[PDB]
RNA sequence: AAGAACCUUACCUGGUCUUGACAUCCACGGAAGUUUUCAGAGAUGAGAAUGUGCCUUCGGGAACCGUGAGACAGGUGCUGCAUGGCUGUCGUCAGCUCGUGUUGUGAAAUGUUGGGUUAAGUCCCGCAACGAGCGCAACCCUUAUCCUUUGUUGCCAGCGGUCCGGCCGGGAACUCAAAGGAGACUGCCAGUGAUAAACUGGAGGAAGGUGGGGAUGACGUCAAGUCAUCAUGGCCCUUACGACCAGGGCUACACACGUGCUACAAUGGCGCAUACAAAGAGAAGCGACCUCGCGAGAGCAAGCGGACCUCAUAAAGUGCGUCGUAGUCCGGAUUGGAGUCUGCAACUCGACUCCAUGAAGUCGGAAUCGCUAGUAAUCGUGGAUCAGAAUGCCACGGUGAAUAC
RNA sequence: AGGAGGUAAAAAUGUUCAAA
RNA sequence: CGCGGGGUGGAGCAGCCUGGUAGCUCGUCGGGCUCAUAACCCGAAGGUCGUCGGUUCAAAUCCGGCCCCCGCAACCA
């Protein structure tokens, strides 16, 4: 579907994740990277993807991986 | 349009040549089928380190006079309004209204 | 006729700081009606972000018996929205007695939750509101426990 | 409004392009812009010397600059003093030696531009517009122009509502292509704002 | 035209048989530029017609073509002020022309397998002036009859 | 809008800066530049190595950097009914004016009306009108026939050599390419017409009465449009309506509409084979050929900044075979899966590929649109915009009607 | 050209002020 | 107190009488013609049949109460 090589993410978040990894599943993340793919070593994390004004939280689970973060933070509000 | 925008564009040109101009290599040879090792990953990960702009896709490219982002001609570097405005003046070398 | 603006302005947020951070999508739950004072306990819904459920409560405790790990902690940053039950004797213009007080008493009146039936002469009236200042809450309770037809008029939970 | 620019429609017929030279897209626009630059700079420091038109030529990396003016003596400063002063600032704006050629036009009223800004000059003086128009007009007609027509538009005199005015004398066959209809503009700023000035001048053919 | 009494367009007669009218008949079936295929369809129909009719084609066609050819038409000229029907003698060019137009018309409908074949059936039915094409012409005859009161 | 992922971008939310992203002037410290680490979303913020060069009449030098102060700066803030320039439009409609003269107290009129004629206040004639001007026409470009010029990367008849490929000697006739010219003028005749313009037919002629097409758009109207391309008078904001950045939005979706694409099929789909264009574009671009992949593409890598190289076997069409009138081998939306390419990045939100999926639709109410010739119709090719992103726009040839009393 | 006879159903309305 | 009749889309009326399936006109809505509106043309939705209960397999319809609305009567006193 996109990018043959290297399920892309932005570094600041990677390290943010790593840091939380050894630190343990703790306080929710302040990622603004909706573009970053969700690597397996992120499950259980309660990262909060920015939403254009809101910074809505998302509780990662196995399946939430190849799918990019943006998918879990709908932008437009309808009805 | 808005001196700030034009300055913003040239800033893009500055950072453009300052980096990738001789550091597009990362996505180049490193993001290539030869070293799919962590090295290639280093590439895709060091690329972000580079300031957001600089990358050519982030070169909106405006008119050299008015600076109107739309209707720009890569040829004269001028927006249709100005290219016409000068062409009529007799400015542009050999450029009369065609009639084929 | 006076029955959105809250969700449009709770979006202004700053109202909750979850485990060291605010700005997270969240909303006060309808099963506790968390009040500014006694902090809260927050739960993370799949969509619609964090679901605050007020500190200490059963449904919030039921979640503990499913995905307790997801549950999180927070405070208030900066007494909007709440309900109040006023079971009372009959009525006889009592509906006015609640409103008579409420009028220029200010507080929002969207809790049209009355129910006059039962068996005896005791109509069961409820009232959701969106009272602002915490002090205002107190003046109401003193001005509403007073009413002759009223037998009870306090923070429904 | 919709009348074709007279100078444009006759480019391949009578009117030579003001900026003769050549290049390719690989280095074209650059030469075109810098061209504009020098023409702009001169527009500035020569508006006081009554330039008519700045033709530019770009041969062998070099940038030649033919300059039409009615008063070369003031353009040149003193013994090419200010002239070379210009060639300096010119090649400075082009990073290339510029052969600054200055050609005098000796019929100041027989040019469009000169007359045009003669008018703007007058509106700058705050002289009543119409006097200025009839002025330049008669000057042209008695100076042999087989045709002339000028126009002014805007507040002119500071009217609440903008108007447009025009006088003509002699044939000005805008559709007769071979007709050498000189045509120039020079917007005229006034306290009430900008005011348009356009001038047509018909002289010959083939 | 309101004025330009323009002379008509001369054409290119048929490559197979000699009829120029045949060629015209190709044209009034030639959708788009597929004139090749149109021509294919044409000769096909003539071939099969020459089969069941047993006759020629160059004229096995006309005995069929004549059957639908109109005698008079009803252009709605509105003499006076208020509008009503007016029969009129049809031009020979428009005669055979409109005739073909109708034949092809009923042929476009009553579609079978081949276009050519269903059309072959048409022309046969026209030879027995029982095709829908003639019925169309017959209709024009009635419009002529009922309005024969006018001039 | 000649192409919204970021950028664009002007909007939102949030985090940010104020003489500032952009400009000069003064002063202060200082090469500019270079490299690198942390934090942060980023902007920025915080440290650290490195560099410190031509006037040296040497505060020193141009530059550039950062700092301070203020003049200022910034505005895509309003105001097209304050404007210029620019544009549509009525409309390529043939009209619209002026001089002096004359008529009338005057507004004005006559000129321009009238008999003809014309694509045309085009033309002739008469006339209190006589002339002039903007416009019509024409001068320009393109296209159609011919001659001259020169002959590559073009072409290649006739000659010779052929691995019968203009492939090779060789050829300047030919296609063609551009340069220069010829030619068409109601010029010839018949007819009509007031011995006028002109109209009608023919001869010849590539071409015929403006041959085809384009270019060019009058005096003006709508206080039409644009103060957001620009420029500009006002007004308005100026520790913010300015300036930076991240994410978002411009792609929302019960609904309505304009303009298009694609179909509903049998003059058609599908399969194999097969013939015939013009127009263009191309350098941090076009990218052969060969290898890999079902493919989009990938690796490798000539040629080309171009009549040679590349995009690049055009498609309809043609032959053969099939499907045989069913929602059907029609239709291709939608959708899942798996991919490719672009680009920091493809979820919101790209394109394209593969496997599968396979809806509405069986020629559309009232109503309404274009079009008279290489047009309509149908078919594919290309270009600007462009990292990528056409069913749009623009451009090019292929095929090829009907009808107009 | 001197003259006669033939010749179109229905189709309403438009807020206020406003420029050398 | 009395007798008779009626309550149906937003309006007016059907259809009930004689059980199953509610139609007409305007109006509302969608499109068209028009410079624009109406008119006109195309197309469309819309009615728990006063309320409750009952009779029945089924009730707009049959039956009873209730609320409304109108009618005729309220005489000899």
From Swiss-Prot, chain A:
Its biological purpose: In the E.coli 70S ribosome in the initiation state it has been modeled to contact the 23S rRNA of the 50S subunit forming part of bridge B1a; this bridge is broken in the model with bound EF-G. The 23S rRNA contact site in bridge B1a is modeled to differ in different ribosomal states, contacting alternately S13 or S19. In the 3.5 angstroms resolved ribosome structures the contacts between L5, S13 and S19 bridge B1b are different, confirming the dynamic nature of this interaction. Bridge B1a is not visible in the crystallized ribosomes due to 23S rRNA disorder. Protein S19 forms a complex with S13 that binds strongly to the 16S ribosomal RNA. Contacts the A site tRNA.
GO molecular function, one term: rRNA binding
Subunit relationships: Part of the 30S ribosomal subunit. Binds S13 and L5 and cross-links to the A site tRNA.
Keyword ATP-binding among UniProt keywords: no
PROSITE patterns, sorted: RIBOSOMAL_S19
Organism: Escherichia coli (strain K12)
Record protein name field: Small ribosomal subunit protein uS19
Keywords on record: Ribonucleoprotein, Ribosomal protein, RNA-binding, rRNA-binding, tRNA-binding
Gene Ontology BP terms: cytoplasmic translation; ribosomal small subunit assembly
Family: Belongs to the universal ribosomal protein uS19 family.
Gene Ontology CC terms: cytoplasm; cytosol; cytosolic small ribosomal subunit
Keyword Ribosomal protein assigned: yes
UniProtKB/Swiss-Prot annotation, chain B:
Recorded GO CC terms: cytoplasm; cytosolic small ribosomal subunit; small ribosomal subunit
Gene Ontology terms: biological process: cytoplasmic translation; ribosomal small subunit assembly; translation
GO MF, one annotated term: structural constituent of ribosome
Presence of the UniProt keyword Ribosomal protein in the record: yes
Domain of life of the source: Bacteria
Record Gene3D superfamilies: 1.10.287.1480
InterPro entries the UniProt entry points to: Ribosomal_uS14 (IPR001209), Ribosomal_uS14_bac/plastid (IPR023036), Ribosomal_uS14_CS (IPR018271)
PANTHER family registered for this protein in UniProt: 30S RIBOSOMAL PROTEIN S14, SMALL RIBOSOMAL SUBUNIT PROTEIN US14M
Protein function: Binds 16S rRNA, required for the assembly of 30S particles and may also be responsible for determining the conformation of the 16S rRNA at the A site.
NCBIfam families per UniProt: PRK08881.1
Assembly and interaction partners: Part of the 30S ribosomal subunit. Contacts proteins S3 and S10.
Record protein name field: Small ribosomal subunit protein uS14
Species this protein is from: Escherichia coli (strain K12)
Upper taxonomic lineage: Bacteria, Pseudomonadati, Pseudomonadota, Gammaproteobacteria, Enterobacterales
Curated annotation (Swiss-Prot), chain D:
Pfam families to which the protein is assigned, alphabetical: KH_2, Ribosomal_S3_C
UniProt KW rRNA-binding keyword: yes
Limits of the KH type-2 domain: 38-106
GO BP annotations, alphabetical order: cytoplasmic translation; ribosomal small subunit assembly
PROSITE patterns with a match to the protein in the record: KH_TYPE_2, RIBOSOMAL_S3
CDD domains given in the database record: KH-II_30S_S3
Gene Ontology cellular-component terms listed: cytoplasm; cytosol; cytosolic small ribosomal subunit
GO molecular function: mRNA binding; rRNA binding; structural constituent of ribosome
UniProt KW keywords: Ribonucleoprotein, Ribosomal protein, RNA-binding, rRNA-binding
Family annotation (PANTHER family): 30S/40S RIBOSOMAL PROTEIN S3, SMALL RIBOSOMAL SUBUNIT PROTEIN US3C
Family note: Belongs to the universal ribosomal protein uS3 family.
Quaternary state and interactors: Part of the 30S ribosomal subunit. Forms a tight complex with proteins uS10 and uS14. With proteins uS4 and uS5 encircles the mRNA as it enters the ribosome, which may play a role in mRNA helicase processivity. Some nascent polypeptide chains are able to cross-link to this protein in situ. In collided ribosomes contacts ribosome rescue factor SmrB.
NCBIfam families, per database record: rpsC_bact (TIGR01009)
Job of this protein: Binds the lower part of the 30S subunit head. Binds mRNA in the 70S ribosome, positioning it for translation.
Protein name, UniProt field: Small ribosomal subunit protein uS3
Source organism of this protein record: Escherichia coli (strain K12)
Gene: rpsC
UniProtKB/Swiss-Prot annotation, chain E:
GO cellular component: cytoplasm; cytosol; cytosolic small ribosomal subunit; membrane; ribosome
GO-annotated biological processes: cytoplasmic translation; negative regulation of translation; ribosomal small subunit assembly; translation
Keyword rRNA-binding tagged: yes
Gene Ontology molecular function terms on file: mRNA binding; rRNA binding; structural constituent of ribosome; tRNA binding
Keyword RNA-binding (UniProt): yes
Annotated keywords: Ribonucleoprotein, Ribosomal protein, RNA-binding, rRNA-binding, tRNA-binding
Reported impact of residue 115 to G: Significantly decreases affinity for its own mRNA
Other observations noted: The strain K12 sequence is shown.
Function description: One of the primary rRNA binding proteins, it binds directly to 16S rRNA where it nucleates assembly of the head domain of the 30S subunit. Is located at the subunit interface close to the decoding center, where it has been shown to contact mRNA. Has been shown to contact tRNA in both the P and E sites; it probably blocks exit of the E site tRNA. Protein S7 is also a translational repressor protein; it regulates the expression of the str operon members to different degrees by binding to its mRNA.
Family the UniProt entry places it in: Belongs to the universal ribosomal protein uS7 family.
Subunit text: Part of the 30S ribosomal subunit. Contacts proteins S9 and S11. Cross-links to IF3 and the P and E site tRNAs.
Protein name: Small ribosomal subunit protein uS7
């Amino acid at each position: 579907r996109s990018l043959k090589k290297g399920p892309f993410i932005d570094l600041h978040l990677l390290k943010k994740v790593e840091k939380a990894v050894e630190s343990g599943d703790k306080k929710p993340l302040r990622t603004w990277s909706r573009r970053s793919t969700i690597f397996p070593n992120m499950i259980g994390l309660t990262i909060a993807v920015h939403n254009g004004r809101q910074h809505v939280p998302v509780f990662v689970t196995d399946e939430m991986v190849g799918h990019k973060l943006g998918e879990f933070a709908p932008t437009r509000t309808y009805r | 349009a808005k001196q700030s925008m034009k300055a913003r564009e040239v800033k893009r040109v500055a950072l453009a040549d300052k980096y990738f101009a001789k550091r597009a290599e990362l996505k180049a040879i490193i993001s290539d089928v030869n070293a799919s090792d962590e090295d290639r990953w280093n590439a895709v990960l060091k690329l972000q380190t580079l300031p957001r702009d600089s990358s050519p896709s982030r070169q909106r490219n405006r008119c050299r006079q008015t600076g109107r982002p739309h209707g720009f001609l890569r040829k004269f570097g001028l927006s249709r309004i100005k290219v016409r405005e000068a062409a009529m003046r007799g400015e542009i070398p050999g450029l009369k209204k065609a009639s084929w | 006729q006076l029955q959105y603006t809250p969700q449009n302005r709770s979006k202004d947020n700053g109202r909750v700081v979850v485990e060291g951070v605010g700005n997270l999508m969240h909303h006060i739950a309808r099963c506790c009606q968390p009040i500014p004072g006694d902090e809260i306990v927050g739960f993370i819904t799949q969509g619609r972000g964090i679901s605050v459920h007020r500190a200490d409560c059963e449904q919030l405790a039921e979640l503990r018996s499913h995905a307790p790990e997801r549950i999180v902690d927070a405070v208030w940053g900066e007494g909007y929205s709440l309900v109040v039950r006023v079971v009372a004797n009959d009525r006889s213009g009592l509906l006015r007695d609640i409103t008579t007080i409420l009028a220029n008493e200010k507080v929002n009146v969207l809790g049209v939750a009355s129910r006059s039936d039962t068996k005896q002469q005791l109509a069961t009236i409820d009232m959701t509101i969106e009272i602002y200042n915490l002090q205002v809450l107190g003046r109401v309770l003193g001005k509403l426990n007073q009413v002759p037809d009223v037998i009870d008029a306090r923070r429904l939970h | 409004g919709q009348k074709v620019h007279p100078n444009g429609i006759r480019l391949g017929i009578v009117k030579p392009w003001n900026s003769t030279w050549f290049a390719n897209t690989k280095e074209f626009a650059d030469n075109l812009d810098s061209d504009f630059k020098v023409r702009q700079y001169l527009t500035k420091e020569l508006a006081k010397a009554s330039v008519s038109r700045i033709v530019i030529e770009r041969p062998a990396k070099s940038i030649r600059v033919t300059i039409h003016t009615a008063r070369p003596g003031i353009v040149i400063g003193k013994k090419g003093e200010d002239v070379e002063k210009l060639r300096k600032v010119v090649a400075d704006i082009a990073g290339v030696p510029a052969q600054i050629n200055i050609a005098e036009v000796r019929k100041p009223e027989l040019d469009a531009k000169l007359v045009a800004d003669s008018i703007t000059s007058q509106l700058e003086r705050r002289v009543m517009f119409r006097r200025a128009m009839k002025r330049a007009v008669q000057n042209a007609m008695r100076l042999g122009a087989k045709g002339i027509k000028v126009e002014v538009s805007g507040r002119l005199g500071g009217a609440e509502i903008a108007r447009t005015e025009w006088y003509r004398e002699g044939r000005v066959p805008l559709h007769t292509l071979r007709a050498d209809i000189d045509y120039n503009t020079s917007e005229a700023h006034t306290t009430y704002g900008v005011i348009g000035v356009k001038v047509w001048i018909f002289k010959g053919e083939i | 035209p309101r004025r330009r009494v323009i002379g008509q367009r001369k054409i290119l007669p048929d490559p197979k048989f000699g009829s120029e009218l045949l060629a015209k008949f190709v044209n009034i079936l030639m959708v788009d530029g597929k004139k090749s295929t149109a021509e294919s369809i044409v000769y096909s129909a003539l071939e099969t017609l020459a089969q069941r009719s047993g006759k020629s084609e160059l004229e096995a066609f006309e005995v069929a073509l004549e059957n639908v050819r109109p005698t008079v038409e009803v252009k709605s000229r509105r003499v006076g002020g208020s509008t009503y029907q007016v029969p009129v003698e049809v031009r020979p060019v428009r005669r055979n022309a409109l005739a073909m137009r109708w034949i092809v018309e009923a042929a476009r409908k009553r579609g079978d397998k081949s276009m050519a074949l269903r059309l072959a059936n048409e022309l046969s039915d026209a030879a027995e002036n029982k095709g829908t094409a003639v019925k169309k012409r017959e209709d024009v005859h009635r419009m002529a009859e009922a309005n024969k009161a006018f001039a």
